[PDB]
Amino acid sequence: SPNSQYLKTRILDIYTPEQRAGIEKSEDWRQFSRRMDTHFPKLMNELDSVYGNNEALLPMLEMLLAQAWQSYSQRNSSLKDIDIARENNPDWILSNKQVGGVCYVDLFAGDLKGLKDKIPYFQELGLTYLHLMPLFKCPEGKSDGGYAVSSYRDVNPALGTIGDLREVIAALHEAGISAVVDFIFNHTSNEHEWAQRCAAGDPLFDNFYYIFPDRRMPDQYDRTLREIFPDQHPGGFSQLEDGRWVWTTFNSFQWDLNYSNPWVFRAMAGEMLFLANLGVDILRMDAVPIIWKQMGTSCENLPQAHALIRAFNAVMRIAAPAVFFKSEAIVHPDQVVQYIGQDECQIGYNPLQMALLWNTLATREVNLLHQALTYRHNLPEHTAWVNYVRSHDDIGWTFADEDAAYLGISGYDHRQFLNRFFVNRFDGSFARGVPFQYNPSTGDCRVSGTAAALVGLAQDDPHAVDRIKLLYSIALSTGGLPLIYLGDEVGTLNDDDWSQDSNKSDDSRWAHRPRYNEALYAQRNDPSTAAGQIYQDLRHMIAVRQSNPRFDGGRLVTFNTNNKHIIGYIRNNALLAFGNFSEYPQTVTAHTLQAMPFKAHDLIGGKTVSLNQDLTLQPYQVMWLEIA
């Protein structure tokens, strides 16, 4: 195996002697040389564990690192400043100053120019982090909402140009906001150049995807594969027009990139350096578990998957230190955390907390949430959760059956109830959602619908507004980077007309992907409207979070409230949070509060609260009590 010093001199072997000597004396190279020394041994180890004695490994690595240097040389100087600043502050994502938003560029603002105009609103809201949904060229009609990529360099013409995006990224930075874009690295669309060329049998693109002659292999793989979109096709495979079969985990027009080929790693690392130099602060690592395949396994969460992500990480540490990773692993909780590490993905989605937030609204019982918060919340140093209430996706019930079992809960039966409840097929349910991917062969089902629809705002349930307040508070205060689905802050309901657009009617996730409601946004300043109540509620909690250092970091300790309806937890030995999940008044007992100070200021309601007597929370009330 080669070393850092060998590759460095081989990189400089493209320059003529005259220029080489000048390059070697420059600041850019010194930094690049330092980072090569620190981070290369990780890159080599990671790739070695995946590719072993592969013929192509060294030439690939030489080619990749030659680009890394060129990419870093061309890297805009203000991005280099961010590079140094994040090398020095690896914990910036752990700061209570961070509050994130996410929106579709078109549905929220028309296009990229219009998006840049909404920046003042983002500053009004207090956002420091903004995820723009898939921005790039994709097939017309059905494209899994942009997640089928036809080019990683060409912006969706309907949104604007590559130029506009750089302008947007720059303006966001001027406003103190980080740009977050998807890195859809598991798959491309079937109209992506690499797809067309691989399928056509271009030797330059051999083994870029998994294409089979017949059903022999697909049949054998399917024996152990999870079906993500069963509505679309069974198992993990789609048939071409020519009769062959391609690996398609998601839609049929989404082809799994083949990471057994090292040149696929190189190609995708090149695409990563490109997005980096655009000024992207955080890449959303889409479908992290899917990137490695092995016969007889579920082809999810395999060791090589982790290694490749760690290899990508090292690439950034070398050529773009500012670029952090956000892990999208919507899987078993034991597997979710395994992607979260400083040399893998520094942050990741927290599907466990989100799902249990909703669970608790339905059961009124905090047992699973409290369990999850007690045993699964705290993370390795320099890493954070992305805590959320809703997203562009369905809600999946991703609690651990093992964990449920210790509580005498049957996972199978509990998901039956949760699914019935949130699609308004359980007596008295306040929820107005729709099924997503009901699977007759597994019993599995997920839930589409906005936060407002799922808490009962559509029928004007008197508790709807408080429910939204309650959910966001937990996301904003547990510890980690909170991500608001833009639209929620004014109580945006479903697009009940999703099912009549024929590019959409097979994907109930559009129910909760409506176009910006201008009437609702006009009301955000009026406390008489639900939009206003929700807005000032959220805006208040954001303000408190960002200015009160009791919220800093990601560590939490659960407080046992001795009431099955009330969640309790402590931040930094100075903040005590209570959340009533009952629609009835619920009491935290004086006996329970014995060890707390006799009085504490509530950051929510503004009042001072007595803790040497019984504490009765109103329906869905949340208290943030300063106890130190």
XYZ file of C-alpha atoms in Angstrom, residues 144 186-187 222 225-237 247-251 254 256 287 289-290 293 298-300 328 330-331 393-394 436-439 442 444-446 506-507 509:
47
model
C -39.611 10.707 -7.148
C -27.029 5.470 -4.222
C -28.729 5.879 -7.598
C -35.210 -10.899 -3.493
C -34.653 -7.843 0.221
C -36.992 -5.297 1.793
C -39.581 -3.792 -0.575
C -39.465 0.027 -0.241
C -42.070 0.913 -2.906
C -44.170 -2.310 -3.251
C -46.825 -0.367 -5.232
C -44.188 0.127 -7.975
C -42.660 -3.343 -8.355
C -41.960 -6.363 -6.231
C -38.506 -7.015 -4.692
C -35.419 -5.053 -5.727
C -35.472 -5.380 -9.542
C -31.121 -3.286 -9.632
C -33.728 -0.711 -8.642
C -34.274 -0.339 -4.884
C -36.710 2.558 -5.311
C -38.628 3.392 -8.486
C -33.917 4.874 -10.321
C -28.607 1.589 -8.075
C -30.205 6.303 1.318
C -27.717 1.882 3.880
C -28.365 0.874 0.272
C -24.925 -5.446 -1.889
C -30.749 -7.651 3.392
C -28.251 -5.486 1.410
C -28.726 -2.739 4.001
C -30.339 9.509 5.868
C -34.377 5.334 8.064
C -33.799 1.859 9.523
C -41.502 11.853 3.243
C -44.029 9.521 4.816
C -48.314 5.160 1.910
C -47.089 1.813 0.577
C -49.528 -0.584 2.169
C -47.873 -3.981 1.711
C -45.886 -7.807 5.206
C -46.387 -2.740 6.684
C -47.777 0.724 5.984
C -46.577 4.327 6.257
C -49.467 6.810 -7.130
C -47.475 8.683 -4.456
C -46.480 11.860 -0.246
